[PDB]
Amino acid sequence: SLVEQFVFEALVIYMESLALAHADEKSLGTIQQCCDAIDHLCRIIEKKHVSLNKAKKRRLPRGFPPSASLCLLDLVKWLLAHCGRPQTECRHKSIELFYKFVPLLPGNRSPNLWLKDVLKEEGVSFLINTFEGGGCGQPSGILAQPTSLQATLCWLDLLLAALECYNTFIGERTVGALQVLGTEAQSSLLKAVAFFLESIAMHDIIAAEKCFTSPQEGERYNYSKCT
């Protein structure tokens, strides 16, 4: 009865909690606990899914802008929206979970071709949603050209989340590179390419910003650079 009333709520709550984990000290084991939690979540979902397959009105998930009888695909597409998010590992586990949930979906269960089905209408919106970042599109990347350190770090987070989303998609073979590159080509990709000549491996202390080691935490900046 409780899961019949509570599956998506706690799931999105844990998503957000781990997102907060990205927002602070990320080395603590709380991330492992959330990972184990969502493992339990996917384990019960794969154990019990037919209720999710039907639109069953549960408690509204905290992250759920609409309001209707909740279905599996509801939160499936909701999580799909929550990709490219500036929580690189939260986004990574999210996309891997969704990938393992395509079998759970009542549509193209075995085929990844459900992504192809949504691609027909969403030919380009994956650039603005699945690859939302880089510069949140462009805009976060243009400010990175004249340039704080925290802004640098969050921009790197967004860019790397988008890049890893690209890599996961292409290596999954669930999407073609020509579909994502050359048709919905992202300027942020080559902007980062240029930024490599700008700051990566030669500006190991600055980003040609002139606007601001431990007094400047160049260690974590370098950690991000190597990442």
Side-chain angles (χ1 to χ4, degrees), residues 89-111:
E89 190 36 56
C90 174
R91 181 261 320 160
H92 160 274
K93 62 182 61 76
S94 81
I95 63 169
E96 292 257 24
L97 283 170
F98 153 75
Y99 168 70
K100 78 186 280 189
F101 296 157
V102 180
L104 278 297
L105 279 169
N108 269 317
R109 320 197 43 99
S110 58

Side-chain angles (χ1 to χ4, degrees), residues 2-185 187 189-216:
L2 308 183
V3 301
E4 184 61 31
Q5 183 62 255
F6 304 103
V7 297
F8 317 118
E9 311 77 350
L11 164 59
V12 306
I13 291 300
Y14 294 161
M15 295 298 102
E16 293 302 326
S17 56
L18 198 150
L20 314 180
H22 271 86
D24 61 349
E25 177 65 30
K26 277 149 275 304
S27 58
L28 197 42
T30 187
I31 52 177
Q32 310 313 123
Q33 305 329 102
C34 310
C35 290
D36 292 331
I38 68 183
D39 170 33
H40 310 332
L41 298 179
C42 65
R43 188 171 180 268
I44 51 187
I45 284 166
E46 70 212 6
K47 172 175 47 57
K48 183 63 174 65
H49 64 119
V50 296
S51 44
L52 295 81
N53 303 352
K54 39 192 181 60
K56 296 312 297 156
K57 184 51 187 173
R58 274 188 186 73
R59 288 288 307 102
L60 194 70
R62 185 259 173 273
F64 201 82
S67 47
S69 191
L70 310 173
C71 176
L72 167 64
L73 177 56
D74 291 331
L75 277 296
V76 169
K77 74 176 188 292
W78 177 100
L79 181 70
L80 177 59
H82 299 61
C83 314
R85 299 323 180 88
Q87 297 77 30
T88 177
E89 190 36 56
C90 174
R91 181 261 320 160
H92 160 274
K93 62 182 61 76
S94 81
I95 63 169
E96 292 257 24
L97 283 170
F98 153 75
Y99 168 70
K100 78 186 280 189
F101 296 157
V102 180
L104 278 297
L105 279 169
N108 269 317
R109 320 197 43 99
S110 58
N112 57 354
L113 307 187
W114 190 97
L115 169 57
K116 284 72 172 177
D117 311 333
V118 67
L119 182 62
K120 309 150 175 163
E121 48 276 23
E122 304 213 89
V124 71
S125 70
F126 300 153
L127 168 58
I128 68 191
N129 189 359
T130 77
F131 324 117
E132 158 203 7
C136 201
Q138 166 56 246
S140 305
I142 178 180
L143 271 297
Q145 311 153 344
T147 54
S148 170
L149 322 172
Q150 310 75 60
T152 306
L153 302 149
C154 69
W155 185 86
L156 298 178
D157 187 309
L158 203 67
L159 174 74
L160 264 54
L163 168 64
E164 182 184 24
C165 176
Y166 270 118
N167 312 336
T168 49
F169 282 5
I170 60 189
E172 205 54 72
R173 288 322 308 146
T174 191
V175 71
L178 77 165
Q179 320 292 140
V180 287
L181 187 61
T183 44
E184 65 182 1
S187 73
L189 318 179
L190 274 299
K191 160 168 49 72
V193 167
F195 285 5
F196 305 150
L197 282 170
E198 162 185 337
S199 193
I200 313 305
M202 71 305 288
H203 285 70
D204 310 339
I205 200 64
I206 204 178
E209 70 178 323
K210 322 304 150 62
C211 61
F212 288 157
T213 184
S214 277
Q216 301 177 1

